[PDB]
Design an enzyme around this catalytic site. Structure first.
Site, PDB file in Angstrom:
ATOM      1  N   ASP A 233      41.645 -21.291  47.311  1.00 16.40           N
ATOM      2  CA  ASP A 233      40.437 -21.380  46.487  1.00 16.40           C
ATOM      3  C   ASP A 233      40.657 -20.693  45.139  1.00 16.40           C
ATOM      4  O   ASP A 233      41.518 -19.820  44.996  1.00 16.40           O
ATOM      5  CB  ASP A 233      39.261 -20.743  47.223  1.00 16.40           C
ATOM      6  CG  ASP A 233      37.907 -21.077  46.569  1.00 16.40           C
ATOM      7  OD1 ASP A 233      37.797 -22.160  45.943  1.00 16.40           O
ATOM      8  OD2 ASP A 233      36.943 -20.273  46.696  1.00 16.40           O
ATOM      9  N   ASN A 234      39.872 -21.103  44.122  1.00 15.37           N
ATOM     10  CA  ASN A 234      39.728 -20.312  42.890  1.00 15.37           C
ATOM     11  C   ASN A 234      41.008 -20.280  42.074  1.00 15.37           C
ATOM     12  O   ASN A 234      41.266 -19.302  41.365  1.00 15.37           O
ATOM     13  CB  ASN A 234      39.274 -18.855  43.139  1.00 15.37           C
ATOM     14  CG  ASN A 234      38.040 -18.781  43.974  1.00 15.37           C
ATOM     15  OD1 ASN A 234      38.083 -18.273  45.095  1.00 15.37           O
ATOM     16  ND2 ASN A 234      36.922 -19.324  43.468  1.00 15.37           N
TER      17      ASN A 234
ATOM     18  N   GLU B  36      31.649 -22.256  42.983  1.00 19.54           N
ATOM     19  CA  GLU B  36      30.500 -22.412  43.869  1.00 19.54           C
ATOM     20  C   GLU B  36      29.206 -22.081  43.134  1.00 19.54           C
ATOM     21  O   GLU B  36      29.110 -21.067  42.416  1.00 19.54           O
ATOM     22  CB  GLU B  36      30.664 -21.494  45.091  1.00 19.54           C
ATOM     23  CG  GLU B  36      30.944 -20.014  44.776  1.00 19.54           C
ATOM     24  CD  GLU B  36      32.444 -19.662  44.808  1.00 19.54           C
ATOM     25  OE1 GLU B  36      33.273 -20.524  44.445  1.00 19.54           O
ATOM     26  OE2 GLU B  36      32.804 -18.520  45.204  1.00 19.54           O
TER      27      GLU B  36
ATOM     28  N   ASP C  69      41.653 -17.048  50.255  1.00 16.79           N
ATOM     29  CA  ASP C  69      40.412 -16.898  49.513  1.00 16.79           C
ATOM     30  C   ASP C  69      40.030 -15.435  49.397  1.00 16.79           C
ATOM     31  O   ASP C  69      38.845 -15.118  49.271  1.00 16.79           O
ATOM     32  CB  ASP C  69      39.330 -17.746  50.183  1.00 16.79           C
ATOM     33  CG  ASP C  69      38.076 -17.911  49.341  1.00 16.79           C
ATOM     34  OD1 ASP C  69      38.138 -17.842  48.085  1.00 16.79           O
ATOM     35  OD2 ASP C  69      37.010 -18.180  49.945  1.00 16.79           O
TER      36      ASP C  69
ATOM     37  N   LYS D 260      42.484 -12.408  44.399  1.00 19.64           N
ATOM     38  CA  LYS D 260      43.430 -13.413  43.921  1.00 19.64           C
ATOM     39  C   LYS D 260      44.826 -12.850  43.666  1.00 19.64           C
ATOM     40  O   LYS D 260      45.812 -13.606  43.770  1.00 19.64           O
ATOM     41  CB  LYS D 260      42.881 -14.111  42.677  1.00 19.64           C
ATOM     42  CG  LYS D 260      41.416 -14.595  42.814  1.00 19.64           C
ATOM     43  CD  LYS D 260      41.157 -15.329  44.122  1.00 19.64           C
ATOM     44  CE  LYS D 260      39.664 -15.352  44.469  1.00 19.64           C
ATOM     45  NZ  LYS D 260      39.434 -15.690  45.920  1.00 19.64           N
TER      46      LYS D 260
HETATM   47  N1  LIG Z   1      43.956  -8.014  51.401  1.00 20.90           N
HETATM   48  C1  LIG Z   1      42.719  -8.528  51.927  1.00 20.90           C
HETATM   49  N2  LIG Z   1      42.802  -8.821  53.226  1.00 20.90           N
HETATM   50  C2  LIG Z   1      41.710  -9.315  53.862  1.00 20.90           C
HETATM   51  N3  LIG Z   1      40.530  -9.516  53.217  1.00 20.90           N
HETATM   52  C3  LIG Z   1      40.475  -9.225  51.905  1.00 20.90           C
HETATM   53  C4  LIG Z   1      41.540  -8.717  51.255  1.00 20.90           C
HETATM   54  N4  LIG Z   1      41.200  -8.516  49.952  1.00 20.90           N
HETATM   55  C5  LIG Z   1      39.906  -8.891  49.830  1.00 20.90           C
HETATM   56  N5  LIG Z   1      39.469  -9.307  51.037  1.00 20.90           N
HETATM   57  C6  LIG Z   1      38.143  -9.827  51.358  1.00 20.90           C
HETATM   58  O1  LIG Z   1      38.217 -11.281  50.806  1.00 20.90           O
HETATM   59  C7  LIG Z   1      36.923 -11.734  50.820  1.00 20.90           C
HETATM   60  C8  LIG Z   1      36.789 -12.713  49.614  1.00 20.90           C
HETATM   61  C9  LIG Z   1      35.743 -13.836  49.733  1.00 20.90           C
HETATM   62  N6  LIG Z   1      35.892 -14.677  48.526  1.00 20.90           N
HETATM   63  C10 LIG Z   1      35.961 -14.750  50.957  1.00 20.90           C
HETATM   64  C11 LIG Z   1      34.940 -15.909  51.011  1.00 20.90           C
HETATM   65  C12 LIG Z   1      35.070 -16.702  52.310  1.00 20.90           C
HETATM   66  N7  LIG Z   1      36.414 -17.294  52.449  1.00 20.90           N
HETATM   67  C13 LIG Z   1      34.063 -17.846  52.246  1.00 20.90           C
HETATM   68  O2  LIG Z   1      34.358 -18.862  51.553  1.00 20.90           O
HETATM   69  O3  LIG Z   1      32.998 -17.818  52.900  1.00 20.90           O
HETATM   70  C14 LIG Z   1      35.980 -10.484  50.721  1.00 20.90           C
HETATM   71  O4  LIG Z   1      35.101 -10.396  51.797  1.00 20.90           O
HETATM   72  C15 LIG Z   1      37.061  -9.356  50.666  1.00 20.90           C
HETATM   73  O5  LIG Z   1      36.560  -8.099  51.260  1.00 20.90           O
HETATM   74  O1  LIG Z   2      34.278 -13.979  40.955  1.00 21.58           O
HETATM   75  N1  LIG Z   2      34.188 -15.096  41.431  1.00 21.58           N
HETATM   76  O2  LIG Z   2      33.655 -16.060  40.871  1.00 21.58           O
HETATM   77  C1  LIG Z   2      34.787 -15.338  42.712  1.00 21.58           C
HETATM   78  C2  LIG Z   2      34.660 -16.614  43.295  1.00 21.58           C
HETATM   79  C3  LIG Z   2      35.272 -16.816  44.522  1.00 21.58           C
HETATM   80  O3  LIG Z   2      35.183 -17.992  45.155  1.00 21.58           O
HETATM   81  C4  LIG Z   2      36.043 -15.809  45.145  1.00 21.58           C
HETATM   82  O4  LIG Z   2      36.637 -16.125  46.315  1.00 21.58           O
HETATM   83  C5  LIG Z   2      36.144 -14.549  44.525  1.00 21.58           C
HETATM   84  N2  LIG Z   2      36.904 -13.451  45.107  1.00 21.58           N
HETATM   85  O5  LIG Z   2      37.284 -13.517  46.261  1.00 21.58           O
HETATM   86  O6  LIG Z   2      37.099 -12.492  44.393  1.00 21.58           O
HETATM   87  C6  LIG Z   2      35.520 -14.304  43.287  1.00 21.58           C
HETATM   88 MG   LIG Z   3      36.648 -18.227  46.649  1.00 22.00          MG
END
Ligand SMILES: Nc1ncnc2c1ncn2[C@@H]1O[C@H](C[C@@H](N)CC[C@H](N)C(=O)O)[C@@H](O)[C@H]1O
Ligand SMILES: O=[N+]([O-])c1cc(O)c(O)c([N+](=O)[O-])c1
Ligand SMILES: [Mg+2]
Length: 214
Positions: free
Chosen positions: A168-169, A198, A140, A143
């Site tokens: 996810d996504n 979400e 997650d 992407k």
């Molecule tokens: N290569 C990476 N390694 C670890 N974290 C990353 C990386 N790239 C982006 N991120 C982090 O990925 C997270 C993306 C979020 N969508 C995570 C949501 C979390 N899984 C949730 O559902 O509550 C952010 O906080 C980013 O800073």
């Molecule tokens: O832009 N978005 O709608 C999302 C949604 C998401 O659920 C993500 O996890 C996200 N991301 O990690 O970049 C971005």
């Molecule tokens: Mg997500």
């Protein structure tokens, strides 16, 4: 005079019950529905995550991307003592929010938060984090890292026959290269769950890819 992630945490601290994971998730989802959208997996897709965990019964889980800790709290609440959810977060401010969220939710004994980029931490898991293989991975993070990290996990010997990848996504914002890989590869058996982004009435989905061995 603060960040959105601080505002989400503060909402939890003032509205949720210490040590009550459900209540933490409900406070985050309410705040993000009503006040400020944020990229947590959220309650509707979270029900699908919960069902995958109930179906496959992981006890060693890896999460890529922690953000504010919503998904770590959501998944850890389903695990029994002795289980381990290792979560990797590249942004140190997000990591600081996640640790406070996990602590407040009462699940800290099941969570190992690592600050760093998934591509740097993944090869350290066996020797520095005492992992044999992973039961389940929740992808997650950004992407464009889904496919390279999946290949890295395999190369590093972290996937066994039966390891569950849950991403996810895969529709919105989308992970087409990851999907094309796991769906075309004899190394994976895939299931797609259609759902919604979400907090929005926009279609999304999650992919479950079971590793079949090399
Ligand atoms: N290569 C990476 N390694 C670890 N974290 C990353 C990386 N790239 C982006 N991120 C982090 O990925 C997270 C993306 C979020 N969508 C995570 C949501 C979390 N899984 C949730 O559902 O509550 C952010 O906080 C980013 O800073
Ligand atoms: O832009 N978005 O709608 C999302 C949604 C998401 O659920 C993500 O996890 C996200 N991301 O990690 O970049 C971005
Ligand atoms: Mg997500």
């Amino acid at each position: 005079g603060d960040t959105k992630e601080q505002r989400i945490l503060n909402h939890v601290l003032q509205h949720a019950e210490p040590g009550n994971a459900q209540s933490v998730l409900e406070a985050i989802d309410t705040y993000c529905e009503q006040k400020e959208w944020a990229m947590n997996v959220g309650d509707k897709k979270g029900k699908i995550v919960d069902a995958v965990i109930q179906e496959h019964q992981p006890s060693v889980l890896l999460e890529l991307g922690a953000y504010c800790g919503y998904s770590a709290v959501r998944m850890a609440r389903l695990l029994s003592p002795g289980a381990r959810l290792i979560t990797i977060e590249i942004n140190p401010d997000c990591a600081a929010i996640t640790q406070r969220m996990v602590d407040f939710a009462g699940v800290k004994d099941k969570v190992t938060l690592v600050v760093g980029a998934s591509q740097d931490i993944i090869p350290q898991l066996k020797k520095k984090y005492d992992v044999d293989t992973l039961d389940m991975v929740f992808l997650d993070h950004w992407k464009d890292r889904y496919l390279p990290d999946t290949l890295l996990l395999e190369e590093c010997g972290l996937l066994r026959k039966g390891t569950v990848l849950l991403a996810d996504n895969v529709i919105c914002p989308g992970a087409p290269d990851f999907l094309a890989h796991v769906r075309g590869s004899s190394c994976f058996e895939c299931t797609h769950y259609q759902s919604f982004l979400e907090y929005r009435e926009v279609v999304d989905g999650l992919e479950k890819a079971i590793y079949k061995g090399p």
